[PDB]
Amino acid sequence: PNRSISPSALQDLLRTLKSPSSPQQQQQVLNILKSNPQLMAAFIKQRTAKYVANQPGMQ
């Protein structure tokens, strides 16, 4: 398998991400992100709302 990730986790993550009007949003999403680490890695790499997209190749 080149993509041995759990779709059940991803689909459940979608549910959780879309409903933020609850204390569960922060807790559950992060835990689900841990279940599908590749997506967690992407989110962490973006640093949420911090702008770390600064590479010394921009003019």
Swiss-Prot record:
Residue stretches spanning the membrane: none
Record note on modification: Methylation of the KIX domain by CARM1 blocks association with CREB. This results in the blockade of CREB signaling, and in activation of apoptotic response. Sumoylation negatively regulates transcriptional activity via the recruitment of DAAX.
Protein name in UniProt: Histone lysine acetyltransferase CREBBP
Gene name of this polypeptide: Crebbp
Purpose: Acetylates histones, giving a specific tag for transcriptional activation. Mediates acetylation of histone H3 at 'Lys-18' and 'Lys-27' (H3K18ac and H3K27ac, respectively). Also acetylates non-histone proteins, like DDX21, FBL, IRF2, MAFG, NCOA3, POLR1E/PAF53 and FOXO1. Binds specifically to phosphorylated CREB and enhances its transcriptional activity toward cAMP-responsive genes. Acts as a coactivator of ALX1. Acts as a circadian transcriptional coactivator which enhances the activity of the circadian transcriptional activators: NPAS2-BMAL1 and CLOCK-BMAL1 heterodimers.
Subcellular location: Cytoplasm; Nucleus
Lineage, opening ranks: Eukaryota, Metazoa, Chordata, Craniata, Vertebrata
Positions where Phosphoserine occurs in the chain: 6, 19, 22
Quaternary organization: Part of a complex composed of MSX3, CREBBP/CBP AND EP300/p300; the interaction with MSX3 decreases histone acetylation activity. Interacts with DHX9 (via N-terminus); this interaction mediates association with RNA polymerase II holoenzyme and stimulates CREB-dependent transcriptional activation. Interacts (via transactivation domain and C-terminus) with PCNA; the interaction occurs on chromatin in UV-irradiated damaged cells. Found in a complex containing NCOA2; NCOA3; IKKA; IKKB and IKBKG. Probably part of a complex with HIF1A and EP300. The TAZ-type 1 domain interacts with HIF1A.
Source superkingdom: Eukaryota
Species this chain originates from: Mus musculus (Mouse)
